[model samples]
Target: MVRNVDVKSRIMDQYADWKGVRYRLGGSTKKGIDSSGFVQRTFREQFGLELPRSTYEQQEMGKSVSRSNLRTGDLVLFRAGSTGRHVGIYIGNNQFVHASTSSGVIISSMNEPYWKKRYNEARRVLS
Candidate 1:
């Protein structure tokens, strides 16, 4: 029953909670988060929804959404490394949050040279 605007506001609220956390594999500390942890915590704290804690499982949870249809709270996924590894969450304005091995909990951009090349897909996390 949440409106789109409501969804956006909630997403912003959740993003604020993990400001400068570093990235770590399988890590979900307030100071650091993995892809699954970001999705799990954001959904639980913002919308009271329990979500899986892995990129593979999360992609299966939502329907495919076009980039034009993307909004706050939507999940943005990227293929990591050369092994088909992945990450998730599209915050807004072509910027996304991800658990990065180098940066930890941080915001990245679709416009970034690296992400632009490896971009795989984006998914919507709502009904």
Candidate 2:
């Protein structure tokens, strides 16, 4: 079985493969992708776990986790203001892999004003 630290390495390794890809609604290729697709893809590629296509579906995949206790590979979700629900893969170090519309797949910190205000919750799906 994979331990928590193992999961962190796997997540970081996978991020290198997808980093800087632009965010698009119907994207699955390396060129572009959505937040949900980003989260779904990483879990499948790195963890060998399948998640639903939509963010909401993946939201209910694992048990709820408190933000303070989030581990690597946990799905960090947010409201993102009027943009609706957004999802990213948490890679510890207070950073998360985000498929942002402006910046694509980039590591963002929780301390940022945007994420801090819109932070929704976390879910653990790597069990």
Candidate 2 residue lDDT tens string, 1-127: 3686788788788788888999898698798999998888888887789999887788898889999998888899998724478999888788998788879889999989989898998998876
Best by lDDT: 2
Q: Estimate each model's TM-score.
A: 0.83, 0.92
List, residue by residue over 1-127, the lDDT tens digit for candidate 1. Answer: 3676687677767767676677666777775677778778888888888888788887777788887877767787777754365665676688877666676667788898988887777777677
Residue 88 shift from truth in candidate 2, angstroms: 0.6
Off by over 4 Å in 2: 81-83
- For this target, which candidate reaches the highest TM-score against the unseen true structure? 2
For model 2, how big is the CA root-mean-square deviation?
1.9
